[PDB]
């Protein structure tokens, strides 16, 4: 319906301008004589930029070796996190940790940070010990005992950092940090370490007679 | 009204400049003699870029096979999630899970991650068991019993990961994870598994005599 | 005032450079002799890009048929949601559900997902049943009764999905999902179905003697 | 101080390269002989793009008529909301509802959704009735009475939608919607309608003996 | 160290390709004979775009008069809010309301909304009266008394809007709006008006015997 | 491995097309005869744009003087906040208030707002006095006493604004503002003023017998 | 399947237009005779921009020295934070503090702020002392004692700032700041200082007999 409107308006204006009035002079204006092939050729290479970008980065990642097949990857700027299964010239395929596929233009990789935890040395452990303002006295001996517990712990890479320190206050909690690594990289082993650690911690706290700290409040009634 | 203003100002300036004063010299400045067809031709191919991009990516997805018809898709960077019903040269049509249609320029796909859970191997299960700080003693035996329960569970792909581990503390809760897959991909079967699982879990907890953990607080009165 | 500054500085520098000193040589530098028409012509087609984009997409949506007049539309990437009332070559007009007008450049549509619920097959129903941790025992029989209730329900498209399953825990609630469609698309009919459904649900729960679940907490006093 | 550094380094390198050593050959490299006028002319039309865009869209909105003077406008993608007071070729002026002025490049409008509630037909009313889980029994009769109240209400456009339906559960509340329009567009009249409506509603609820619902919780003590 | 690597690899490949093997043919490839001045000249005008944009918009704001010196400005899209102290060709200087300076490229202004409250007519007043669900009966007489109080108030521009209406429910509160302007623009006068207003309001409420509404909740114990 | 695939596919197609079939005609297509130096030269000046932008803005900030060495700077659009230590042609170096270094492309500055609190006149003070709804009566005398306290305060620039006014209600609090400047700019002096001020305020409140306001709530039990 | 559609439609239209009708005239339109090599050559240098950008910035960071190997880095605009292990011409490699690798295009660095805490002078300490409104009297003597404690503290760089001042009120807390540096940069030493500090603080508070402040509320019952 609307192209009828466009064509009818153009046909109306032209036929009226050339029947009511009629052109004494002659204009040489050809809608189709314009040889300017050049325009579409020009337009070819511009139009296809994502694909062109993909082949370049595919080549480079075929030479540059950020990651390899079967390596756990993550990105900190995009939700791109799994294991490589394949490369392509333009895009790769990842199995997510949902055992699901992920198809990805590689041109993305050119301007984005990239991480390979499957290349890493070790895994990390951190926690925060919510302790009560009541328990302020015993903090140093708790921490020190705690540091010793980790230092006598086998699964740790003692040559990596080991930090046990009351770093900050908080709302109704006195938060001691933890920062320890494992000389393993096996997820399950790391978690077993984490578990036994937390348990030994709790043993230590409750052995010192102090207690952890929920959120807390102070009320005035009426 | 305003084109009257523009045209009147131009006509005023010109007619005044050419009647009050009048040009002794002669300037050859033609508003219409400029042959530069070239400009509009140039402008053609630039103006139509989204459409041009759509045809290219349509061709490529006709060759490249990220997804196929009738496959559940999702994206992690856009709310694009349903089942394909059709392809076009430029855009496709998805039925959402609202049984609603979705029309989409394919040029988008060129620079965006893509997922095909309908191609996947399996489905996933995870949970977090909110346990009370009181219940710290029984955690290992609970977990181990729990691990055994899953390992004796039929619907699981035991060859896929099976992680039951106290991964973190929290506000008033001791959170044990769960990470288990199903050798099925049928949504309803997966959910039935999930249901029976949760029930067996609860049985296990309350059989151990411990209890789950709501949010909790500690109050000081006046 | 400030053009006085610009012109005065230029006039000062020039008149001083040509009166204190005066140019022995002769430079042929003409501020106006530059024939380069080419620049403004070039600038014409570039300057007007939004309008140019609008006409193209207007043509395509006149050929491509994402939506039609009088169809409820929504977008998931922009707050664009109403019923079409009109097309234009460049922009359309929507009545929002406020019975208000909305004027829109069509060039937008080229690079944006689009939805036509007024083309859909059916409408959807979902809910989440907040149940108490106390009520863990009766969950399966509740669900099953509930599934039967829907299956014996007339207004449902039983050939579409029907999922009743305890999908997740939560803070102080055991959340059973619901996922059911209606073979209607009439908003009001859909809502009447929804209403009667919720009522039958509540009847079922309270007939089983269990109860729903508010948010809950656990307090320790002093 | 720093241009002394730049010029001194260049002068040092050159004078040393041409006094310690001295050029046997002769290079014809002129810092100023480059006739390439072309560069600045090129740069003219590119540099001024926002202004160029403003004039185009000013013309089009002088032809295209999204809005008119004295019309309440809003945008859903930008905080642009008031009444037009003026047009310009490039920008317009809005009085906000703070009785404050707003000056705006019109080029913005080319690629942005636009709304004219001052062109609308009617105004809207919606609410959500927080009812208690206790009150589940009386919901249908409440709703139906409520629907009748609106239907017997004069200021309503009964030919527009009238939806009164229990659409969703919530945290400690059973939320019934409302969706009704007014055949007026006068803000104050609309509000008077809204007020009397809410009052009649409350009368209806408390006449049925049920009650509304605050947020609520369930506590376990120690 | 690394340029040694680059240069050494290039020198190694070349010297090996021209000593182990040696070129029978002769290639005329000159790293420096390329006359293409054109490239750097081209690059000049492109490189300096922000500065070029600043001069243009500086000229226009020297002609276009969005704001003037000493005028309070704000933007709704950027945290740009103070009083002008100066103009420049490219950038201006604002004193913030911290009595601090702010230096700003003017090119920004070309594509951004702009506001001049220092040009305004009047200032605004709004509030929301949190009333209890208990107090539903007295709402109309309260509002009406309240409307009268404002109407008999001197500092108001009664010819501007005056809206006192129960616009919405809320969590544990019945929220009546306020919308009134002052025929002044002096900040301090406006605030004195606001203060005395709020006081008269409170007098009115507590004179009617009703009361305001905090957040509230409803508890079920165990 | 994959370049073997690319090269092998090309070699396979070509050798098969030229051995199974063989070209009767002769095509003059040279992969290397293309003289188009022009492409890489073109590409030079485009590729290096960030660096080019940095030198320009470095020159301008060497002429334009937004900031100087040793001046506290901040930006409202980026977390760029410290003291200048150095300029470069392309980038500068800031010491943050962590006594840490910050290296920055200057091209950024071209299109970003900029602030120099180290150039300012004075520092600012503001607060909000949470008062209880009970205390509504005494507000004016409190404020007035408070205004007098500041007016008799030495360290204030009384010629700058001094606003003490009940500006808004809130959840369980009646919030009076404060807006006062110091004729100093020394951080520590400003803070000492702030401290003594707050103390005098508290003295004033508790001398009037009223009290501040925490968050508050209203409970209904069962 | 779909290329069959495209090719079949084109073949159908052409063969029908040239068999049903047949071209009396002769058009010289060659799909392959277009010599315009120029297009792909043009497209080469444009397509590869990320890589080109990487080499430039690699060179510059090889000359410009923001950071060096083994230096802790962070960015305030991206989650880019670890220790350098390597440089490349285009990208570098960071070990995160997870002992994980990070591969990064250097072109990013050109337009982004950068920080080198491993180059810093010192580390920082800050805290906020939540004190009760009850404790308003003792604030100055507490602060002053506290200032003295730090001033007599060895590990501090007393020549750097030392600020102890009641800077703000808050919800149920009177918040005194802390701002002190350490003449060390060793993480663990800094934390040991922090720990002993916090302890001395607590000693000071509880020695003054006042107490810290949790969140607090004020309740009205029914």
Swiss-Prot record, chains A, B, C, D, E, F, G:
GO cellular component term, pick one: plasma membrane
One GO molecular-function entry: mechanosensitive monoatomic ion channel activity
Location in the cell: Cell inner membrane
GO terms, biological process: cellular response to osmotic stress
Disulfide bonds: none
Residue intervals passing through the bilayer: 37-56
Superkingdom assignment: Bacteria
Predominant location: membrane
Stretches assigned to the Cytoplasmic side: 57-222
Bilayer topology term: Multi-pass membrane protein
Keyword field: Cell inner membrane, Cell membrane, Ion channel, Ion transport, Membrane, Transmembrane, Transmembrane helix, Transport
Similarity comment: family membership: Belongs to the MscS (TC 1.A.23) family.
Reported function: Mechanosensitive channel that protects cells against hypoosmotic stress when highly overexpressed.
Assembly and interaction partners: Homoheptamer.
Protein name, entry field: Low conductance mechanosensitive channel YnaI
Organism: Escherichia coli (strain K12)
Residue window of the full protein shown: 149 to 334 of 343
């Amino acid at each position: 319906x609307x192209x009828x409107x466009x064509x009818x308006x153009x046909x109306x204006x032209x036929x009226x301008x050339x029947x009511x009035x009629x052109x004494x002079x002659x204009x040489x204006x050809x809608x189709x004589x314009x040889x300017x092939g050049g325009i579409g050729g020009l337009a070819v290479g511009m139009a296809g930029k994502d694909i062109l970008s993909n082949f370049f980065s595919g080549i480079m990642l075929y030479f540059d070796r950020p990651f390899s097949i079967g390596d756990w990857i993550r990105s900190p700027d995009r939700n791109i996190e799994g294991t490589v299964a394949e490369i392509g010239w333009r895009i790769t395929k990842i199995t997510t940790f949902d055992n699901r596929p992920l198809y990805v233009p590689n041109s993305l990789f050119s301007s984005i940070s990239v991480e390979n935890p499957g290349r890493m040395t070790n895994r990390r452990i951190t926690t925060t010990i919510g302790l009560r303002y009541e328990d302020a006295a015993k903090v140093g001996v708790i921490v020190e005992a705690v540091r010793e517990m980790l230092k006598n712990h086998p699964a740790i890479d003692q040559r990596q950092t080991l930090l046990v320190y009351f770093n900050q206050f908080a709302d109704s909690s006195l938060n001691i940090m933890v920062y320890c690594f494992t000389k393993t990289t096996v997820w399950a082993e790391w978690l077993a370490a984490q578990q036994d650690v937390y348990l030994k911690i709790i043993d230590i706290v409750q052995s010192h007679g102090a207690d952890f700290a929920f959120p807390s409040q102070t009320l005035y009634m009426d």
